[PDB]
Amino acid sequence: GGQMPIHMRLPKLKGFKNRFRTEYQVVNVGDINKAFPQGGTVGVDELVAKGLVRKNSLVKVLGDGKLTVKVDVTANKFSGSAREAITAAGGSATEL
Amino acid sequence: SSSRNGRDSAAQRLGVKRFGGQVVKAGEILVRQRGTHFHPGVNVGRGGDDTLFALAPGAVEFGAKRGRKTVNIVPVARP
Amino acid sequence: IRPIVKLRSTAGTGYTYVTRKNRRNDPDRIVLRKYDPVLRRHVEFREER
RNA sequence: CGCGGGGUGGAGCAGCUCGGUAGCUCGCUGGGCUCAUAACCCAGAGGUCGCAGGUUCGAAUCCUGUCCCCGCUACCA
RNA sequence: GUUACGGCGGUCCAUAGCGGCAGGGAAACGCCCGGUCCCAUCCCGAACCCGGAAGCUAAGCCUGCCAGCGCCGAUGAUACUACCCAUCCGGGUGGAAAAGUAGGACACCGCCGAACAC
RNA sequence: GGCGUCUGGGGGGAACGCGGGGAAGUGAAACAUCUCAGUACCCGUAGGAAGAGAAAACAAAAUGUGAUUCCGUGAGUAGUGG
RNA sequence: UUUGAAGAAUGAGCCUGCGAGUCAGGGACAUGUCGCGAGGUUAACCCGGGUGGGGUAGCCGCAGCGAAAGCGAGUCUGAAUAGGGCGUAUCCACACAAGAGUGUGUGGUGUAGUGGUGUGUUCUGGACCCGAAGCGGAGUGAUCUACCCAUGGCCAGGGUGAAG
RNA sequence: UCAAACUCCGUGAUAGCUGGUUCUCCCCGAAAUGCAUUUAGGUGCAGCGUCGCAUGUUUCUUGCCGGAGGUAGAGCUACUGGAUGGCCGAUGGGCCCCACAGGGUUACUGACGUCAGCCAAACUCCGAAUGCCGGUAAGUCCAAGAGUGCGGCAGUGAGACGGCGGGGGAUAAGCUCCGUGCGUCGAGAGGGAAACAGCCCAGAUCGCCGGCUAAGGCCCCUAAGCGUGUGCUAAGUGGAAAAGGAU
RNA sequence: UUGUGCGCCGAUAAUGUAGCGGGGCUCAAGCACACCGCCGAAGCCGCGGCAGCCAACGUGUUGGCUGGGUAGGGGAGCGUCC
RNA sequence: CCGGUGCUGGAAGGUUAAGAGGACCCGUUAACUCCCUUUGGGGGUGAAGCGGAGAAUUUAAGCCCCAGUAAACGGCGGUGGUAACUAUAACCAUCCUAAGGUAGCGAAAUUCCUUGUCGGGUAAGUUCCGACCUGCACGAAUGGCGUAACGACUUCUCAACUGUCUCAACCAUAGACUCGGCGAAAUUGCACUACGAGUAAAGAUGCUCGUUACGCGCGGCAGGACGAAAAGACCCCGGGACCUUCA
RNA sequence: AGUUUAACUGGGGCGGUUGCCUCCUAAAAUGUAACGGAGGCGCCCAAAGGUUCCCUCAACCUGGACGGCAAUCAGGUGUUGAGUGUAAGUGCACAAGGGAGCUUGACUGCGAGACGGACAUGUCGAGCAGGGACGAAAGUCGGGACUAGUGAUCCGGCACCUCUGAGUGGAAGGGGUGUCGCUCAACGGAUAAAAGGUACCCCGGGGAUAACAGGCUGAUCUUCCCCAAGAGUCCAUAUCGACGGGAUGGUUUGGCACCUCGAUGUCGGCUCGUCGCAUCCUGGGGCUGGAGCAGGUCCCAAGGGUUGGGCUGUUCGCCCAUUAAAGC
Predict the structure, then answer these.
(1) Can you name the residues that pair with B62 across neighbouring β-strands?
(2) How many CB atoms lie within 10 A of CB C23?
(3) Residues B59, B43: contact at Cβ < 8 Å?
(4) Chains that touch B (3 or more CB pairs under 8 A)
């Protein structure tokens, strides 16, 4: 109605967007424990196969759920909780 | 001709927001006022704009104390 | 020029800022007033002209 | 239809509020020059822009009714 | 436990106040005596503070007497009033119900302490 | 410059193409930036297609791809914008 | 169309025909339905005389918070274990803290989207239909009319009577 | 055809403007308000409708209880102001003693104070009723088809009259502007009011050559009573009207 | 002389009675107070039909409540053509 | 009247673009180096070159400025007093101006008041003529005052003339009327389209209560059908167009 | 050449206004409109903030040198009438009023919960921490007794930041935090940037809105009337009838804006009339300060009649002659 509209009387949201952003497709250790009840080698290809992450994507692993099984996880990044849970189960957490 | 009047301020919505018996949380505005037509008492505090707010839960109790009209908050004893 | 201007009281020992207002017809530019800064604690603040 | 607008010594004009209003010319009064005006000297004298109100301490000064001759008043069909 | 009592409080902070006219000094409250000390006066030991105990309940404080001034104050009635009835009557119903007036209402309650009692 | 001779052009054509020129209504609830729109229109030119095209390119540290054009995505994103 | 019209407000002479929410888009939102399902789906394109079969590039879901670096069921702020914001699908049970509104841990249950398609709104488009005055581009027009150029023609009759 | 020709094209120009928008039935059902607006005849959002989902009586009504208000009314010697008459009498004006002061005295003004009676939207020592907030117990409760939250879809955002309270206006307007869990029309037929959207009665599912009623009416028009009883009226009052006049 | 219930005057426009809707009404068909009946609606009831919501019971009947309606929302349908 | 705005001329100054000018500064880093410990890595300085930001200084017109110009656009005053009756004011004082409207004209094609006043003309003259000047709001090339002649101009008067009129009558012709023939039109919601007083969207053929009225035509009149025509041109809102300008 | 040139508006224009705060209107919650009634704001204060402590005025009376009503001094009365930075209101004497000392909380990070609420805005806020001020301590302090004292967004500037750094290291630029720049005052702020005319006008619309007429109202106007102070030699009422008061009518100027703006043609005249009576003449009558003639005033009466000319567009009016009269 000529009132200064909501999309102009409000401030533009702060900040920028960082075109050089390294975004990671994330998978949780609980999802891993469900996908691989027996354990074993676990890599980006296997996670893509089991439908946990997307192809052609950097992968990060996160410690949300419970992990009980031995896994030689291979991803691009790991969180501390994820790494610790993996090693507590007794497997390994390799970064490429 | 013309009138030199025509102005008015915005209504400030002063008044009593929580009357006697109304159970209120702490910080609840009880009384919006300019001066101290209502004074603060038990578990009630006075803001910069002479607004009365509960400092604790309870039911609002309107009382008097040395002629002043007061606003008090009486505790609600849990069962 | 206004009598009561912005002032922009800055700090000694680190030149960060607090802002308030003060009349120009006071016979000075130097409103030395203590204040709490971030990154340090209570110190004297002056008005950078 | 309706609106608008300055006032101050006797005359004409100035002067916006640090706490007085006043000043100029003319006029007038007294004296002097002259045998008797004008021009000279002043002790020169001279006013509350009317009352109400200031935030007033106090308002010519500021604000309103009044103070009132005021330039513009103009409903176009 | 009793005081003509000293504090600390309370009341829909006036039924409590003011002003009476007659009284009290046990401890206490007080005036009061002095400024050496802490402290103090935009000047003043008046006050604040300190040290004291000469005399005095004169005052404050306290007790009794009160409708003199103020305060409280119903009832009933009236006004006003939500709803209702009523074709103007702002009439009337049933509900609520003032102000003013008038009749009448003159401090009380608690805790501690003191002297005494005990 | 004149004379002679020879070779050719000239104009048309619905659309598409390349290069140039280039509006305004409109929208922005006004309007000028902006948009409409490089549209309409115009000009010059073609060819059966044209243009472009064989890196003084992309890319980002991958032993990378390897002319150009076109299609889809990227994405109504990054950004741009009184 | 109006507060309100039989209305003396509008429109309609009558009949017959025609005459207005449509279409496109992997568009947006919501809803229904179908398929599959933590996956769903292909686009261009290829092969098919078809409506079928291939096609993983991408897209949406699958982890969020933060300006971002980044960290990650946490994260941002912040000196903070000190609170708040957003998020941790939801619910159940227990336990402990609290009764400042309830929270924190443990266990369990375990999260539902996506692509077709219908419908309703919506975006870009003429966008339900009709309607201007007017703006712009390019052209047509001076055989009407205005003015001018060239060349021709016309102005009965009667008077007045300048210069020379 | 000329305050910028005509034609074609852009072009289906754009128009907050006007008009038009075609079959049916069932259920529900508004608004004409607020805020903002180069806005005021438009639009956004809210309010109000519908649909769906979730919740479920939280809504609403009544009783009771707890509460805050400053209206009506009243009061003012309770404030600010206004204001009547008395009383006193400063104060001044005069007079006389006549200076100048200090005195008495007044044809006068006569403040302040006081006695009595009064007034006020911007006065209040007071102070309702209502309404509002909250709580509580019930009611309705095969329904109000409630309320709240979310979302889809809206329309409305020109209101009108009447009752009550009020402003503006001449306490005029079929005036205007507000308020009112006030109404009706709007969007509501039917009956009455002669006719007559907004007044009264009453909210139309359809049918019936059945009955009771409301408002309003019962001599004839016109259905029902030239009803009964007691009075009144002489003016056709009834079946318009004032100050005021009136054996 | 007081108050009251009815009345009188004041009273006064212009197409035509025209300020009871009309006739006509005081032998009230006028006013007041009481009383008695009746008329009177698409209200309520009665009989019947239909629909919506809900409930109950049964795997479709009964019952209750509701059913004016503009903008508008929702639902279900008729008809036309291919 | 050169104050304003223009136009012309001038340029001692002031200001002023691009261009020259490139200081200084910044970025980078060859090299110096300092710790910090690492197996090299974080702080300072910093040449040249390349870049970026670009100061001082110089630089024209224009503008400011200095003069002129009004047959350039334009502008050409107030207050108060004063003469032996009164009246006015030749005269004076004062304020402001760039200058204060001269001659001449003047209730005007200009004068609101206003039918100004006076005179003339008329029986009677808001018009006309002459004159006065109190010029709301004349005025000298947006020319002033006059002017013979001219004018389908405007205004007034007079003679003559007349049907313009008192006051209308008659004749013919073309229509209208009748017959024959051809044969439209605008308009149109309908229709066996009364009047009064009312009521009503406030002016009724259509409603109410009454009154009046046999049905159908022909010629006529024009009061109504808020008659037809043209989506009011005035007004407003919205939008255009064209025009103006120190937007 | 393209465009702008606001809206509200009891039609529009002119005038005025536009945001914020306070009161009344406002109908005892909140809220509530009007070109309704009154005022104020677009700041100030480095103390006029914070804290600790202390005090209580104004007015009046009395006494006092200049000194006066009123300066400062003393005493008394005085519970609030003063004063509160500034409008008003609400409050404040318990002080929020007056004074002194020390100070900078006129903080940083946050904020349970609320108010208000179309949205955007706005408002209060106990409490935790940090580091402080005051205070013995409790505690208070995140500006002011309160409510106004201000401006969204975009854009850009400055300072700081362990953010980013278009191959890499840097840098530029961007980003965060704090903050600055708009009488954008038409104050929810169309553009960074904008005035007018149209009678040459056009289009779309409107009876949503004016002019004519109608309708309502009836201030005004008109026609009467009530009281009767009085003028009238006396005598209120033969006649006029003040101050005041009540009404008619609906013809005047108006108010409203209800039909009509997809058309209701306007003044005056001409023609034709028709109606009312508030009667100009004619007619009838009462009173008279009516001797008579002639009148005045009032009542009844609307049958008929109610001239022609000069001026002016004119209605109206003045004038000329007449008339029984020259009606409204």
Answers:
(1) B71
(2) 10
(3) no
(4) none
